[PDB]
């Protein structure tokens, strides 16, 4: 009567501490009822590893809480998938990236920030790259007991940016007598802590003029989710204190247009702040920095991501021998890196949205799937071909 279809698939990412453990679930319909098999996304079947990974009932793959000593990479840093299968054929779920992280001490640092008097300053909370997936800045604190939270600007001067930095307008020599520490939160342990070091502004008096200079290391391409607020920085120091202008390149050209500042898109000193991000905010942005001595510019690439989904039209069709079978994968999300097709769990080497079988023979019956992928996400849709 029916080939398998997924009712419930596990999400693309399962991140958890060794204390929390995890369970992921896969449910499929069909007639006869499909067997549910857990595999590594590569295709190997996976089994029971005592205390670490348990195929449970209800179709649940269970990662019990475990001691640091019992960490196993092949179990705990692994991409899994669910394979649903009956006599009519096989479907494979989206990828399931499992990352069990053993609770472990980390610290964030705040270093000295050297600035020319009169310029803006950006104080950064430095989170080691290998924990940064799990740690975010909550708030900023000074020795004089000022506390700054994400939201509005304080005293026309201090702003905690959406990207976590503390932005300070128009630094004066008095600003060198404060030190700054950030509070960070680890989303897998739920713990918060203050930074191990405190940072201060070191203010240089402007005695010589100088053209704006930007740092050697600049923001690599960004990927940020729709509906969130984005901030693009443009760090630069010079004397006279420079002014800042943002542009967005016209895609595929060397031509650019001035970013249009309004209710949604605002500029704070050299920082561009985009609220309620939409996919069309993606692109290459250029910040141009000027004073009466000279100018400089830096490019930043932004991709605003949206969740991947896929659906095949039609869900099932019956086609008489020798006639054509067409399946159309319809998808949403951003970016889409690839579209690719599978038949009963095996790649069939077609990478376009519409799959056409010219003349249906007997071994063309079975389950077909469309997968849409980018670097972080995957989504699948399935469909059945029956012979008439």
Ligand X SMILES: *[C@@H]1O[C@H](CO)[C@@H](O[C@@H]2O[C@H](CO)[C@@H](O[C@@H]3O[C@H](CO[C@H]4O[C@H](CO)[C@@H](O)[C@H](O)[C@@H]4O)[C@@H](O)[C@H](O[C@H]4O[C@H](CO)[C@@H](O)[C@H](O)[C@@H]4O)[C@@H]3O)[C@H](O)[C@H]2NC(C)=O)[C@H](O)[C@H]1NC(C)=O
Ligand Y SMILES: *[C@@H]1O[C@H](CO)[C@@H](O[C@@H]2O[C@H](CO)[C@@H](O[C@@H]3O[C@H](CO)[C@@H](O)[C@H](O)[C@@H]3O)[C@H](O)[C@H]2NC(C)=O)[C@H](O)[C@H]1NC(C)=O
Q: Is 130 in the site for ligand Y (CB under 6 A)?
A: no
Shortest Cβ distance from residue 133 to ligand Y (Å)? 17
* CA–CA gap between residue 368 and residue 329 (Å, rounded): 11
73 binds Cl ion (CB under 5 A): no
Residue 254 interacting with ligand X (CB under 6 A): yes
Segment interacting with ligand X (CB under 6 A) among 158-166, 190-198, 224-232, 293-301: 293-301
| Among residues 72, 228, 337, 356, the one that binds ligand X under rule CB under 6 A | 337
Nearer to ligand Y, 52 or 304 (CB): 52
- How big is the site for Cl ion, counted in residues (CB under 5 A)? 4
Q: What is the DSSP string of 312-348?
A: EESSEEEE-TTS-EEEEEEEEEE---EEEEEETTEE-
Residue 40 CB, nearest distance to ligand Y (Å)?
24
Q: Which of 1, 42, 44, 152 binds Cl ion (CB under 5 A)?
A: 44
Would you tell me which residues interact with a copy of itself (CB under 8 A)? 68, 71, 73, 76-77, 100-102, 104, 106-107, 109, 111-112, 114, 116, 126, 128-130, 132-133, 196-197, 202, 204-205, 207-211, 213-220, 236-239, 292-293, 298
Pick 50 or 215: Cβ nearer a copy of itself: 215
Asked if residues 287 and 245 have their Cβ atoms less than 8 Å apart, the reply is yes
Q: How far apart are CA 173 and CA 98, in angstroms?
A: 50
**Residue (104 or 351) nearer to ligand Y, CB:** 104
Q: Taking the complex as a whole, how short is the minimal distance between the CB of residue 92 and a copy of itself, in angstroms?
A: 20
In the complex with a copy of itself, which residue's Cβ is closer, 115 or 277? 115
Q: Tell me which residue of 74, 213, 196 sits closest to 135, measured CA to CA.
A: 196
Closest CA to 34 of 57, 4, 7: 4
Instruction: Compute the distance between CA of residue 168 and CA of residue 217 in angstroms, rounded to an integer.
Output: 20
DSSP 266: E
Integer CA distances (angstroms), 314 to 2, 203, 345, in order? 15, 66, 19
In the complex with ligand Y, which residue's Cβ is closer, 79 or 102?
A: 102
Q: Counting contacts by CB under 6 A, is residue 297 touching ligand X?
A: yes
Question: Residue 317 touches which of Na ion, Cl ion, a copy of itself, none (CB < 5 to 8 A by kind)?
Answer: Na ion
Cβ–Cβ under 8 Å, residues 282 and 302:
yes
Closest listed residue to residue 81, CA positions, set 6, 150, 152, 31: 6
Interaction partner, residue 65 (a copy of itself, ligand X, ligand Y, none; CB < 5-8 Å by kind): ligand Y
Give how far the C-alpha of residue 385 lies from the chain's centroid of Cα atoms, to the nearest Å: 36
Site for ligand Y in 17-56 (CB under 6 A): 18-19
Query: Residue 177 or residue 321: which is nearer to a copy of itself going by CB?
Result: 177
Q: Which of 225, 222, 224, 243 is nearest to 234 (CA)?
A: 243
**Residue 106 interacting partner from Cl ion, ligand X, a copy of itself, none (CB closer than 5 to 8 Å by kind):** a copy of itself
The verdict on 205 binding ligand Y (CB under 6 A) reads: no
Asked whether position 373 contacts ligand X by CB under 6 A, the answer is: yes
Q: Which of 17, 12, 277, 301 has the alpha carbon at shortest distance from 135?
A: 17
**CA torsion angle 154 155 161 166 (round to 10):** -100
Contact 167, 159 (CB under 8 A): yes
383 binds, among Na ion, ligand Y, Cl ion, none (CB under 5 to 8 A by kind): Na ion
| Contacting residues for 242 by C-beta, under 8 A, at least 6 apart | 119, 212, 236, 270, 289, 290, 291
340 binds ligand X per the rule CB under 6 A: yes
Q: Which of 102, 126, 265, 286 binds ligand Y (CB under 6 A)?
A: 102
For position 229 contacting Cl ion by CB under 5 A, the verdict is: yes
DSSP state of 75: H
| Pair of tokens at residue 246 | 């943002």
The footprint of Na ion on residues 291-330 (CB under 5 A) is 314, 317, 327
Question: Is residue 88 a contact point for Na ion (CB under 5 A)?
Answer: yes
Residues that bind ligand X (CB under 6 A): 254, 288, 290, 295-297, 337-338, 340, 351, 371, 373
Residues that bind Cl ion (CB under 5 A): 44, 74, 228-229
């Amino acid at each position: 009567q029916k080939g398998p279809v997924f009712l419930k698939e596990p999400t693309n990412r399962i991140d958890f501490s060794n204390s929390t453990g995890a369970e992921i679930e896969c449910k499929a319909s069909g007639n006869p009822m499909p067997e549910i098999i857990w595999i590594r996304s590569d295709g190997t079947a996976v089994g029971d590893v005592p205390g670490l990974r348990q195929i449970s009932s209800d179709g649940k793959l269970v990662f019990p809480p475990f001691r640091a000593e019992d960490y196993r990479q092949e179990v705990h840093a692994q991409v899994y998938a669910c394979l649903a299968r009956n006599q009519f054929g096989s479907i494979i779920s989206r990828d399931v990236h499992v990352r069990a992280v053993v609770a472990q001490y980390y610290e964030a640092d705040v270093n000295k920030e050297h600035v020319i008097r009169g310029n803006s300053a950006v104080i950064k909370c430095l989170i080691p790259s290998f924990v940064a997936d799990f740690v975010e800045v909550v708030s900023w604190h000074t020795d004089e007991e000022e506390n700054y939270f994400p939201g509005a600007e304080y005293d026309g001067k201090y702003l905690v940016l959406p990207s976590g930095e503390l932005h300070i307008r128009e630094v004066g020599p008095e600003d060198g007598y404060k030190s700054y520490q950030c509070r960070t939160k680890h989303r897998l342990t739920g713990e918060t802590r203050l930074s191990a070091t405190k940072g201060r502004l070191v203010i240089t008096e402007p005695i010589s003029s100088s053209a704006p200079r930007t740092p050697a290391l600049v923001q690599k391409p960004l990927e940020l989710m729709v509906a969130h607020t984005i901030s693009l920085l443009c760090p630069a120091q010079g004397f006279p204190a420079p002014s800042f202008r943002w542009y967005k390149f016209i895609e595929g050209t060397t031509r650019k247009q001035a970013v249009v500042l309004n209710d949604r898109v605002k500029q704070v000193s050299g920082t561009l702040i985009i609220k309620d991000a939409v996919v069309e905010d993606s692109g290459k942005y250029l910040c141009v920095v000027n004073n009466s001595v000279g100018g400089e510019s830096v490019e930043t690439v932004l991709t605003v991501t949206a969740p991947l989904s896929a659906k095949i039209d039609p869900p099932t069709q019956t086609v008489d021998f020798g006639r054509p079978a067409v399946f159309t994968c319809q998808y949403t999300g951003n970016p889409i890196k690839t579209v690719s097709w599978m038949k009963d769990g095996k790649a069939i080497g077609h990478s376009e949205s519409v799959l056409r079988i010219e003349s249906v023979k007997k071994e063309d019956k079975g389950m077909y799937q469309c997968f849409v992928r980018n670097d972080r996400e995957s989504a699948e849709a399935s469909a059945e071909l029956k012979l008439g």
